[PDB]
Design a protein around this ligand. Structure first.
Ligand SMILES: O=C(O)C[C@@H]1C(=O)Nc2ccc(F)cc21
Ligand SMILES: [Cl-]
Ligand SMILES: [Mn+2]
Ligand SMILES: [Zn+2]
Ligand SMILES: [Zn+2]
Length: 455
Protein backbone atom coordinates (compact mmCIF):
# COMPACT_ATOMS: atom_id res chain seq x y z
CA UNK A 1 0.00 0.00 0.00
CA UNK A 2 1.22 3.45 -1.02
CA UNK A 3 4.85 2.17 -1.35
CA UNK A 4 5.91 -1.45 -1.77
CA UNK A 5 9.70 -1.89 -1.71
CA UNK A 6 11.06 -3.77 -4.74
CA UNK A 7 12.79 -7.08 -4.01
CA UNK A 8 16.42 -6.86 -2.87
CA UNK A 9 19.17 -7.03 -5.51
CA UNK A 10 21.97 -9.62 -5.14
CA UNK A 11 24.60 -8.98 -2.48
CA UNK A 12 28.07 -10.48 -2.82
CA UNK A 13 30.62 -11.03 -0.06
CA UNK A 14 33.81 -12.11 -1.88
CA UNK A 15 36.79 -13.62 -0.03
CA UNK A 16 40.05 -11.76 -0.46
CA UNK A 17 41.02 -14.32 -3.11
CA UNK A 18 37.79 -13.63 -5.06
CA UNK A 19 38.10 -9.89 -4.41
CA UNK A 20 41.72 -9.39 -5.43
CA UNK A 21 40.87 -9.12 -9.13
CA UNK A 22 37.78 -6.97 -9.73
CA UNK A 23 37.51 -7.90 -13.41
CA UNK A 24 37.65 -11.65 -12.68
CA UNK A 25 35.09 -11.14 -9.92
CA UNK A 26 32.72 -9.02 -12.02
CA UNK A 27 32.90 -11.65 -14.77
CA UNK A 28 32.07 -14.37 -12.23
CA UNK A 29 28.93 -12.65 -10.85
CA UNK A 30 27.70 -11.52 -14.28
CA UNK A 31 25.26 -14.40 -14.91
CA UNK A 32 23.48 -13.52 -11.66
CA UNK A 33 23.83 -9.73 -11.56
CA UNK A 34 22.96 -9.00 -15.20
CA UNK A 35 19.51 -10.44 -14.41
CA UNK A 36 18.94 -7.72 -11.81
CA UNK A 37 20.88 -4.88 -13.41
CA UNK A 38 22.53 -3.77 -10.19
CA UNK A 39 24.25 -5.69 -7.42
CA UNK A 40 26.00 -4.84 -4.20
CA UNK A 41 29.50 -5.88 -3.20
CA UNK A 42 30.77 -5.99 0.37
CA UNK A 43 34.58 -6.02 0.39
CA UNK A 44 36.44 -8.46 2.70
CA UNK A 45 36.39 -7.23 6.33
CA UNK A 46 39.94 -5.89 6.34
CA UNK A 47 39.78 -4.13 2.97
CA UNK A 48 39.54 -0.67 4.52
CA UNK A 49 40.87 2.25 2.47
CA UNK A 50 41.79 5.25 4.61
CA UNK A 51 39.26 8.11 4.44
CA UNK A 52 40.89 11.35 5.61
CA UNK A 53 40.07 14.93 4.69
CA UNK A 54 39.97 18.46 6.07
CA UNK A 55 36.27 19.31 5.94
CA UNK A 56 37.08 23.03 6.13
CA UNK A 57 39.39 22.98 3.10
CA UNK A 58 37.32 20.88 0.72
CA UNK A 59 34.85 23.05 -1.15
CA UNK A 60 32.45 22.66 -4.05
CA UNK A 61 29.64 24.35 -5.95
CA UNK A 62 26.25 22.98 -4.92
CA UNK A 63 23.63 22.04 -7.47
CA UNK A 64 19.96 22.57 -6.64
CA UNK A 65 17.28 19.98 -7.20
CA UNK A 66 13.49 20.06 -7.09
CA UNK A 67 11.89 16.75 -6.15
CA UNK A 68 8.86 16.16 -8.36
CA UNK A 69 7.99 12.80 -9.92
CA UNK A 70 7.93 12.86 -13.74
CA UNK A 71 9.36 16.38 -13.82
CA UNK A 72 12.17 16.91 -16.35
CA UNK A 73 15.66 17.33 -14.93
CA UNK A 74 18.86 17.86 -16.90
CA UNK A 75 21.81 15.47 -16.68
CA UNK A 76 24.69 17.05 -14.76
CA UNK A 77 27.46 18.68 -16.79
CA UNK A 78 31.06 19.07 -15.63
CA UNK A 79 27.62 29.60 -4.75
CA UNK A 80 29.95 27.52 -2.55
CA UNK A 81 29.93 25.15 0.45
CA UNK A 82 32.84 23.66 2.33
CA UNK A 83 32.33 19.99 3.15
CA UNK A 84 31.66 21.17 6.72
CA UNK A 85 29.05 23.85 5.94
CA UNK A 86 27.33 21.48 3.51
CA UNK A 87 27.31 18.78 6.18
CA UNK A 88 25.85 21.20 8.74
CA UNK A 89 23.13 22.26 6.29
CA UNK A 90 22.44 18.63 5.34
CA UNK A 91 22.15 17.38 8.93
CA UNK A 92 19.99 20.30 10.08
CA UNK A 93 17.71 19.74 7.06
CA UNK A 94 17.12 16.09 7.84
CA UNK A 95 16.86 16.67 11.58
CA UNK A 96 14.30 19.47 11.06
CA UNK A 97 12.37 17.60 8.39
CA UNK A 98 11.68 14.69 10.69
CA UNK A 99 12.11 16.36 14.12
CA UNK A 100 14.36 13.42 14.98
CA UNK A 101 18.09 13.10 15.70
CA UNK A 102 19.53 13.36 12.24
CA UNK A 103 20.64 9.87 12.43
CA UNK A 104 17.94 7.95 14.13
CA UNK A 105 15.49 8.07 11.18
CA UNK A 106 14.70 4.56 9.81
CA UNK A 107 15.80 3.93 6.21
CA UNK A 108 12.38 2.41 5.49
CA UNK A 109 10.75 5.66 6.59
CA UNK A 110 13.00 7.97 4.56
CA UNK A 111 12.23 5.79 1.51
CA UNK A 112 8.47 5.81 2.13
CA UNK A 113 8.61 9.58 2.61
CA UNK A 114 10.69 10.20 -0.48
CA UNK A 115 8.09 8.55 -2.68
CA UNK A 116 5.31 10.48 -0.90
CA UNK A 117 6.94 13.87 -1.32
CA UNK A 118 7.89 13.50 -5.00
CA UNK A 119 4.32 12.45 -5.84
CA UNK A 120 2.69 15.27 -3.87
CA UNK A 121 2.41 18.43 -5.96
CA UNK A 122 1.64 20.51 -2.85
CA UNK A 123 5.09 19.69 -1.41
CA UNK A 124 7.84 21.93 -2.79
CA UNK A 125 10.99 20.33 -1.35
CA UNK A 126 14.33 21.36 -2.85
CA UNK A 127 17.69 19.93 -1.84
CA UNK A 128 21.33 20.48 -2.79
CA UNK A 129 24.15 18.13 -3.74
CA UNK A 130 27.65 17.92 -5.17
CA UNK A 131 28.59 16.34 -8.48
CA UNK A 132 31.87 16.73 -10.36
CA UNK A 133 35.15 15.06 -11.25
CA UNK A 134 38.12 15.35 -8.87
CA UNK A 135 39.85 18.73 -8.73
CA UNK A 136 42.40 20.60 -6.63
CA UNK A 137 39.45 21.99 -4.64
CA UNK A 138 37.88 18.57 -3.98
CA UNK A 139 39.88 15.46 -4.79
CA UNK A 140 39.22 11.73 -4.92
CA UNK A 141 38.20 9.93 -1.73
CA UNK A 142 40.76 7.27 -2.73
CA UNK A 143 44.54 7.68 -2.38
CA UNK A 144 46.23 9.21 -5.41
CA UNK A 145 49.95 9.77 -6.01
CA UNK A 146 51.42 13.12 -4.95
CA UNK A 147 52.36 15.07 -0.22
CA UNK A 148 53.81 12.14 1.68
CA UNK A 149 51.40 9.21 1.97
CA UNK A 150 51.05 6.88 4.95
CA UNK A 151 51.79 3.16 4.43
CA UNK A 152 48.01 2.57 4.78
CA UNK A 153 47.43 4.95 1.85
CA UNK A 154 50.26 3.44 -0.19
CA UNK A 155 48.59 0.04 0.22
CA UNK A 156 45.47 1.22 -1.59
CA UNK A 157 47.19 3.25 -4.32
CA UNK A 158 47.24 0.37 -6.77
CA UNK A 159 44.12 -1.48 -5.70
CA UNK A 160 41.91 -2.66 -8.54
CA UNK A 161 38.99 -1.31 -6.47
CA UNK A 162 40.56 2.13 -6.16
CA UNK A 163 38.28 3.73 -8.72
CA UNK A 164 41.00 6.04 -10.05
CA UNK A 165 42.74 2.93 -11.37
CA UNK A 166 39.78 1.18 -12.98
CA UNK A 167 40.05 3.22 -16.20
CA UNK A 168 43.79 2.75 -16.84
CA UNK A 169 43.70 -0.98 -16.06
CA UNK A 170 44.34 -3.64 -18.71
CA UNK A 171 40.98 -5.43 -18.81
CA UNK A 172 39.32 -2.01 -19.13
CA UNK A 173 38.75 -1.43 -22.82
CA UNK A 174 38.21 2.35 -22.30
CA UNK A 175 41.86 2.54 -21.19
CA UNK A 176 43.50 2.71 -24.59
CA UNK A 177 41.12 5.44 -25.73
CA UNK A 178 43.54 8.25 -26.55
CA UNK A 179 40.57 10.59 -26.88
CA UNK A 180 39.85 13.16 -24.18
CA UNK A 181 36.69 11.87 -22.53
CA UNK A 182 37.21 13.24 -19.01
CA UNK A 183 33.52 12.96 -18.15
CA UNK A 184 33.61 9.23 -18.86
CA UNK A 185 37.00 7.81 -17.84
CA UNK A 186 37.38 9.82 -14.63
CA UNK A 187 35.50 9.21 -11.39
CA UNK A 188 32.68 11.51 -10.37
CA UNK A 189 32.50 12.72 -6.78
CA UNK A 190 29.04 12.93 -5.17
CA UNK A 191 28.35 14.70 -1.87
CA UNK A 192 24.78 13.79 -0.89
CA UNK A 193 22.10 14.90 1.55
CA UNK A 194 18.71 13.46 2.57
CA UNK A 195 16.51 13.03 -0.55
CA UNK A 196 19.14 14.31 -3.03
CA UNK A 197 18.49 12.07 -5.93
CA UNK A 198 19.74 10.60 -9.18
CA UNK A 199 17.12 10.25 -11.89
CA UNK A 200 16.61 7.08 -13.94
CA UNK A 201 19.50 6.70 -16.37
CA UNK A 202 21.88 4.32 -18.07
CA UNK A 203 25.58 4.99 -18.60
CA UNK A 204 27.03 6.53 -21.76
CA UNK A 205 27.74 3.88 -24.42
CA UNK A 206 25.92 1.35 -22.19
CA UNK A 207 29.05 1.01 -20.09
CA UNK A 208 29.30 -0.60 -16.67
CA UNK A 209 29.60 1.62 -13.64
CA UNK A 210 30.81 1.05 -10.13
CA UNK A 211 29.91 3.31 -7.23
CA UNK A 212 31.65 3.33 -3.86
CA UNK A 213 30.20 4.93 -0.74
CA UNK A 214 33.18 6.32 1.17
CA UNK A 215 31.28 7.43 4.26
CA UNK A 216 28.00 8.66 5.69
CA UNK A 217 24.40 7.58 5.64
CA UNK A 218 23.23 5.01 3.09
CA UNK A 219 22.36 5.45 -0.58
CA UNK A 220 19.13 3.81 -1.68
CA UNK A 221 19.14 2.28 -5.19
CA UNK A 222 16.66 1.00 -7.71
CA UNK A 223 17.89 -1.07 -10.64
CA UNK A 224 16.47 -2.66 -13.77
CA UNK A 225 18.22 -5.42 -15.78
CA UNK A 226 19.56 -4.50 -19.21
CA UNK A 227 17.11 -6.86 -20.91
CA UNK A 228 14.21 -4.64 -19.78
CA UNK A 229 15.67 -1.30 -20.88
CA UNK A 230 13.22 -0.77 -23.74
CA UNK A 231 10.29 -1.85 -21.56
CA UNK A 232 11.24 0.88 -19.10
CA UNK A 233 11.67 3.47 -21.81
CA UNK A 234 8.23 2.64 -23.21
CA UNK A 235 6.68 3.12 -19.76
CA UNK A 236 8.56 6.40 -19.45
CA UNK A 237 7.48 7.64 -22.84
CA UNK A 238 3.84 6.88 -22.10
CA UNK A 239 3.86 8.76 -18.77
CA UNK A 240 6.41 11.52 -19.50
CA UNK A 241 6.63 12.05 -23.30
CA UNK A 242 8.24 15.51 -23.06
CA UNK A 243 11.40 13.78 -21.81
CA UNK A 244 11.74 12.21 -25.23
CA UNK A 245 11.61 15.38 -27.34
CA UNK A 246 14.88 15.15 -29.32
CA UNK A 247 17.70 16.66 -27.22
CA UNK A 248 19.79 19.34 -28.98
CA UNK A 249 23.03 18.34 -27.22
CA UNK A 250 24.79 15.95 -24.85
CA UNK A 251 24.28 18.79 -22.35
CA UNK A 252 20.49 18.70 -22.55
CA UNK A 253 19.68 15.05 -21.95
CA UNK A 254 16.45 14.94 -19.94
CA UNK A 255 15.92 12.52 -17.06
CA UNK A 256 13.30 12.01 -14.34
CA UNK A 257 12.21 10.64 -10.98
CA UNK A 258 9.76 7.76 -11.28
CA UNK A 259 8.29 5.50 -8.61
CA UNK A 260 9.57 1.94 -9.07
CA UNK A 261 6.08 0.65 -8.19
CA UNK A 262 4.89 2.33 -11.38
CA UNK A 263 7.44 0.33 -13.39
CA UNK A 264 6.58 -2.86 -11.50
CA UNK A 265 2.90 -2.28 -12.27
CA UNK A 266 3.85 -2.23 -15.94
CA UNK A 267 5.73 -5.54 -15.61
CA UNK A 268 9.20 -3.99 -15.52
CA UNK A 269 11.38 -5.93 -13.09
CA UNK A 270 12.93 -3.64 -10.45
CA UNK A 271 15.38 -4.39 -7.64
CA UNK A 272 16.49 -2.28 -4.70
CA UNK A 273 19.29 -1.98 -2.20
CA UNK A 274 20.57 0.25 0.57
CA UNK A 275 24.26 0.82 -0.05
CA UNK A 276 26.07 1.56 3.20
CA UNK A 277 29.46 3.17 3.80
CA UNK A 278 32.27 0.90 2.58
CA UNK A 279 30.10 -0.91 0.05
CA UNK A 280 30.13 -0.98 -3.75
CA UNK A 281 27.25 -0.96 -6.15
CA UNK A 282 27.93 -2.22 -9.68
CA UNK A 283 25.62 -1.47 -12.60
CA UNK A 284 25.65 -3.64 -15.73
CA UNK A 285 25.41 -2.58 -19.40
CA UNK A 286 22.12 -0.80 -20.23
CA UNK A 287 20.84 -1.38 -16.68
CA UNK A 288 18.63 1.54 -15.68
CA UNK A 289 19.14 2.84 -12.16
CA UNK A 290 17.94 5.63 -9.91
CA UNK A 291 18.04 6.44 -6.20
CA UNK A 292 18.41 8.95 -3.40
CA UNK A 293 20.59 9.54 -0.36
CA UNK A 294 19.36 8.79 3.15
CA UNK A 295 21.41 11.66 4.52
CA UNK A 296 24.79 13.42 4.40
CA UNK A 297 27.28 11.20 2.56
CA UNK A 298 30.07 10.98 -0.03
CA UNK A 299 30.25 8.60 -2.98
CA UNK A 300 32.59 8.13 -5.92
CA UNK A 301 31.70 6.35 -9.12
CA UNK A 302 33.33 5.54 -12.45
CA UNK A 303 32.41 4.03 -15.81
CA UNK A 304 34.24 1.03 -17.19
CA UNK A 305 34.08 -1.40 -20.07
CA UNK A 306 35.14 -5.03 -19.97
CA UNK A 307 35.62 -7.26 -23.03
CA UNK A 308 32.15 -8.67 -22.37
CA UNK A 309 30.77 -5.22 -23.17
CA UNK A 310 32.37 -4.81 -26.63
CA UNK A 311 29.41 -6.18 -28.68
CA UNK A 312 26.99 -4.10 -26.60
CA UNK A 313 29.13 -1.05 -27.21
CA UNK A 314 28.76 -1.54 -30.97
CA UNK A 315 24.99 -2.07 -30.58
CA UNK A 316 24.76 1.07 -28.47
CA UNK A 317 26.33 3.24 -31.17
CA UNK A 318 23.92 1.78 -33.70
CA UNK A 319 21.11 2.66 -31.33
CA UNK A 320 22.49 6.20 -30.87
CA UNK A 321 22.44 6.58 -34.68
CA UNK A 322 18.75 5.59 -34.86
CA UNK A 323 18.01 8.21 -32.17
CA UNK A 324 20.32 10.88 -33.63
CA UNK A 325 22.11 10.98 -30.29
CA UNK A 326 25.68 12.26 -29.89
CA UNK A 327 28.52 9.83 -29.09
CA UNK A 328 31.04 10.34 -26.32
CA UNK A 329 33.68 8.62 -28.44
CA UNK A 330 34.06 6.62 -31.64
CA UNK A 331 33.70 2.90 -30.91
CA UNK A 332 35.45 2.01 -34.17
CA UNK A 333 38.28 4.40 -33.39
CA UNK A 334 38.73 2.61 -30.07
CA UNK A 335 38.77 -0.80 -31.79
CA UNK A 336 41.40 0.34 -34.33
CA UNK A 337 43.54 1.99 -31.65
CA UNK A 338 43.61 -1.33 -29.77
CA UNK A 339 44.38 -3.25 -33.00
CA UNK A 340 47.27 -0.84 -33.62
CA UNK A 341 48.57 -1.81 -30.17
CA UNK A 342 47.93 -5.54 -30.58
CA UNK A 343 51.38 -6.62 -29.36
CA UNK A 344 50.94 -5.04 -25.90
CA UNK A 345 47.30 -6.04 -25.49
CA UNK A 346 46.13 -8.49 -22.88
CA UNK A 347 45.50 -11.72 -24.85
CA UNK A 348 41.83 -12.23 -23.95
CA UNK A 349 41.25 -8.58 -24.79
CA UNK A 350 43.01 -9.19 -28.11
CA UNK A 351 40.75 -12.16 -28.85
CA UNK A 352 37.54 -10.23 -28.14
CA UNK A 353 38.64 -7.12 -30.03
CA UNK A 354 39.43 -9.40 -33.00
CA UNK A 355 35.82 -10.58 -33.08
CA UNK A 356 34.34 -7.08 -32.98
CA UNK A 357 36.83 -5.91 -35.58
CA UNK A 358 35.72 -8.68 -37.95
CA UNK A 359 32.13 -7.49 -37.66
CA UNK A 360 33.24 -3.89 -38.18
CA UNK A 361 35.19 -4.77 -41.31
CA UNK A 362 32.39 -6.77 -42.88
CA UNK A 363 29.86 -3.99 -42.12
CA UNK A 364 32.25 -1.38 -43.56
CA UNK A 365 32.81 -3.46 -46.69
CA UNK A 366 29.06 -3.57 -47.35
CA UNK A 367 28.51 0.14 -46.64
CA UNK A 368 31.27 1.08 -49.09
CA UNK A 369 29.79 -1.16 -51.77
CA UNK A 370 26.44 0.55 -51.27
CA UNK A 371 27.77 4.08 -51.56
CA UNK A 372 29.82 3.13 -54.66
CA UNK A 373 26.56 1.94 -56.25
CA UNK A 374 25.04 5.33 -55.43
CA UNK A 375 27.60 6.95 -57.71
CA UNK A 376 30.21 8.09 -55.22
CA UNK A 377 33.48 7.44 -57.02
CA UNK A 378 36.21 9.78 -55.78
CA UNK A 379 37.87 8.94 -52.49
CA UNK A 380 40.69 10.12 -50.24
CA UNK A 381 42.23 8.86 -47.01
CA UNK A 382 41.33 11.03 -44.06
CA UNK A 383 42.74 10.95 -40.54
CA UNK A 384 39.42 11.34 -38.73
CA UNK A 385 41.04 11.06 -35.29
CA UNK A 386 42.69 14.49 -35.83
CA UNK A 387 39.33 16.25 -36.14
CA UNK A 388 37.63 17.59 -33.04
CA UNK A 389 34.52 15.45 -32.46
CA UNK A 390 32.10 18.25 -33.34
CA UNK A 391 33.85 18.53 -36.69
CA UNK A 392 33.18 14.90 -37.60
CA UNK A 393 29.57 14.20 -36.68
CA UNK A 394 27.14 13.00 -39.34
CA UNK A 395 24.91 15.98 -40.19
CA UNK A 396 21.89 13.66 -40.04
CA UNK A 397 22.36 11.17 -37.18
CA UNK A 398 25.19 12.92 -35.27
CA UNK A 399 27.34 9.74 -35.07
CA UNK A 400 31.06 10.38 -34.64
CA UNK A 401 32.68 9.37 -37.93
CA UNK A 402 35.90 7.39 -38.03
CA UNK A 403 35.93 4.47 -40.49
CA UNK A 404 34.53 6.65 -43.28
CA UNK A 405 32.26 9.51 -44.30
CA UNK A 406 30.99 11.40 -47.32
CA UNK A 407 31.95 15.01 -48.03
CA UNK A 408 31.10 17.45 -50.84
CA UNK A 409 32.93 20.64 -51.95
CA UNK A 410 29.47 22.19 -52.07
CA UNK A 411 29.16 21.88 -48.26
CA UNK A 412 32.70 22.55 -46.97
CA UNK A 413 33.43 20.88 -43.63
CA UNK A 414 30.16 18.95 -43.51
CA UNK A 415 30.08 15.15 -43.30
CA UNK A 416 27.57 12.35 -43.37
CA UNK A 417 28.19 8.75 -42.33
CA UNK A 418 27.67 6.09 -44.98
CA UNK A 419 24.08 5.41 -43.81
CA UNK A 420 23.11 8.96 -44.78
CA UNK A 421 24.79 9.69 -48.11
CA UNK A 422 21.52 11.25 -49.34
CA UNK A 423 21.37 13.72 -46.46
CA UNK A 424 24.39 15.88 -47.20
CA UNK A 425 23.36 18.18 -50.07
CA UNK A 426 21.52 18.38 -53.38
CA UNK A 427 24.61 17.89 -55.56
CA UNK A 428 24.80 14.66 -57.54
CA UNK A 429 26.90 11.91 -55.87
CA UNK A 430 29.75 12.12 -58.43
CA UNK A 431 30.60 15.43 -56.75
CA UNK A 432 31.02 13.52 -53.47
CA UNK A 433 34.13 12.02 -51.96
CA UNK A 434 34.41 8.94 -49.80
CA UNK A 435 36.71 9.95 -46.94
CA UNK A 436 38.11 6.81 -45.30
CA UNK A 437 40.59 6.14 -42.50
CA UNK A 438 41.77 2.74 -43.80
CA UNK A 439 41.52 0.69 -46.98
CA UNK A 440 40.16 -2.82 -46.55
CA UNK A 441 43.74 -3.92 -47.31
CA UNK A 442 45.03 -1.91 -44.33
CA UNK A 443 42.40 -3.42 -42.05
CA UNK A 444 42.90 -7.17 -42.54
CA UNK A 445 46.56 -7.08 -41.36
CA UNK A 446 45.49 -5.08 -38.28
CA UNK A 447 42.95 -7.73 -37.50
CA UNK A 448 45.57 -10.44 -38.10
CA UNK A 449 47.91 -8.92 -35.53
CA UNK A 450 45.11 -9.33 -32.98
CA UNK A 451 44.65 -12.96 -33.99
CA UNK A 452 48.40 -13.61 -33.58
CA UNK A 453 48.43 -11.94 -30.17
CA UNK A 454 45.36 -13.96 -29.16
CA UNK A 455 47.23 -16.98 -30.57
O1 LIG B 1 26.35 5.84 -9.86
C1 LIG B 1 25.26 6.47 -9.92
O2 LIG B 1 24.60 6.49 -10.99
C2 LIG B 1 24.72 7.22 -8.71
C3 LIG B 1 25.39 8.58 -8.59
C4 LIG B 1 25.22 9.14 -7.36
O3 LIG B 1 25.57 8.55 -6.36
N1 LIG B 1 24.72 10.36 -7.29
C5 LIG B 1 24.42 10.77 -8.73
C6 LIG B 1 23.89 11.90 -9.30
C7 LIG B 1 23.75 11.96 -10.70
C8 LIG B 1 24.15 10.85 -11.52
F1 LIG B 1 24.01 10.91 -12.85
C9 LIG B 1 24.70 9.69 -10.93
C10 LIG B 1 24.84 9.62 -9.56
CL1 LIG C 1 7.62 17.71 -4.46
MN1 LIG D 1 24.87 5.83 -13.05
ZN1 LIG E 1 24.59 9.30 -40.20
ZN1 LIG F 1 27.15 19.47 -52.60
Amino acid sequence: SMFLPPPECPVFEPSWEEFADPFAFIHKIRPIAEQTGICKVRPPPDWQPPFACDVDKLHFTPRIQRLNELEAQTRVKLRDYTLRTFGEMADAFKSDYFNMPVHMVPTELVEKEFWRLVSTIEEDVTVEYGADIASKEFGSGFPVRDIKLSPEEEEYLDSGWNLNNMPVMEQSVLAHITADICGMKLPWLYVGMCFSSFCWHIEDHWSYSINYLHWGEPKTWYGVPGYAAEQLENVMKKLAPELFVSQPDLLHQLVTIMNPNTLMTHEVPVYRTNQCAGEFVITFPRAYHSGFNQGFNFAEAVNFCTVDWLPLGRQCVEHYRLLHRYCVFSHDEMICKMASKADVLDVVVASTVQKDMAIMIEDEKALRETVRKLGVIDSERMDFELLPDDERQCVKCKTTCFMSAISCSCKPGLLVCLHHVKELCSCPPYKYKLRYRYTLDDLYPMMNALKLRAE
